[PDB]
A paper describes a structure:
We describe the design, kinetic properties, and structures of engineered subtilisin proteases that degrade the active form of RAS by cleaving a conserved sequence in switch 2.
In both cases, a catalytic amino acid is mutated to Gly and the vacated space is occupied by a network of conserved water molecules in the absence of the cognate cofactor. Structures of RASProtease(I) without imidazole have three conserved waters (19, 81, and 122) that interact with Oδ1 and Oδ2 of D32, CO of S125, NH of G64, Oγ of S62, and Oγ of S221. When imidazole binds, these waters are displaced, the imidazole nitrogens H-bond to Oδ1 and Oδ2 of D32 and Oγ of S221, and the charge relay system is reconstituted. RAS-specific proteases have an expanded S4 site that binds numerous solvent molecules in the enlarged S4 pocket.
Author numbering: 1 to 74, 84 to 275
């Protein structure tokens, strides 16, 4: 990664890199607004668009998908990225498009799905598709939501709110919960999500904040773990990330805490 970011060291990814693990031979689908495949610092191995008004997955007219891609590669520099466009330039999409992306990911033997997207209400049909992905062995990671708090109510967005999905909230560089990061019993782990510098469309770079930025740290961590332990199931990868996280506070706000990929990979 050409842009410096504190998040990679924060989750202890350099310890894996020192051990010689960089996520080789791990297929990571980024279900988002596309990936700018012409960016000099990205390589994209394949993809598909399901957004009828935006038919190229290898361009990104929003910026999120590219940024997210860059984070996954900063964490797991050898991962293979797949651009699955399920959101348009406004970062919005239909539930069916998300389903078609998930199905494409299953058909094309992805190891990890990253969904940095969140609907407040969810879709029964999306649930079925994510659960199917997880049953087929895919590690499914999603942004917990940028809906802050709501007293004692959960604010975790769908599809993160489903139990089959790893819901990733955002901490800042001080390991404090970001004011926007959703909360609730469904929140699983935290990762860096404030002012994360990564790739942007048109060969650019810049900081973005959100649980969408936290999620790909965890998708990259999953790739690092699978490169060290290619025989582990998705169940085993998830368990390793949740069980070895660094506790940060009440699980309503922090889940199990900050992922620690060095501990998870032991
Ligand atoms: K490129
Ligand atoms: K969850
Ligand atoms: K929780």
């Amino acid at each position: 990664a050409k842009c410096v970011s504190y998040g990679v060291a924060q989750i202890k990814a350099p310890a894996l890199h020192s051990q010689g693990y960089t996520g080789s031979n791990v297929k990571v689908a980024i279900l988002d607004t596309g990936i700018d495949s012409s960016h000099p610092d990205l390589n994209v191995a394949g993809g598909a668009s399901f957004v009828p008004s935006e038919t190229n997955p290898f361009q990104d007219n929003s910026s999120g998908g590219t940024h997210i891609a860059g984070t996954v590669l900063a964490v797991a520099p050898s991962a293979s990225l797949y651009a699955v466009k399920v959101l348009g330039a406004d970062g919005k999409g239909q539930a069916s498009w998300i389903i078609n992306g998930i199905e494409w990911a299953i058909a094309n033997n992805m190891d990890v799905i990253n969904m940095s997207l969140g609907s407040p209400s969810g879709s029964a049909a999306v649930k079925a598709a994510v659960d199917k992905a997880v049953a087929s062995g895919v590690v499914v990671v999603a942004a917990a939501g940028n809906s802050g708090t709501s007293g004692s109510s959960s604010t975790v967005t769908y599809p993160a709110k489903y139990p089959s999905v790893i819901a990733v909230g955002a901490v800042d560089s001080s390991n404090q919960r970001a004011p926007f990061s959703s909360v609730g019993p469904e929140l699983d782990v935290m990762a860096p999500g404030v002012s994360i510098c990564s790739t942007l469309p048109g060969g650019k770079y810049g900081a973005l904040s959100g649980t969408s930025m936290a999620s790909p740290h965890v998708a990259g961590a999953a790739a690092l773990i699978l490169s060290k332990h290619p025989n582990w199931t998705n169940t085993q990868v998830r368990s390793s990330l949740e069980n070895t996280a660094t506790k940060l506070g009440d699980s309503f706000y922090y889940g199990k805490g900050l992922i620690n990929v060095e501990a998870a990979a032991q």
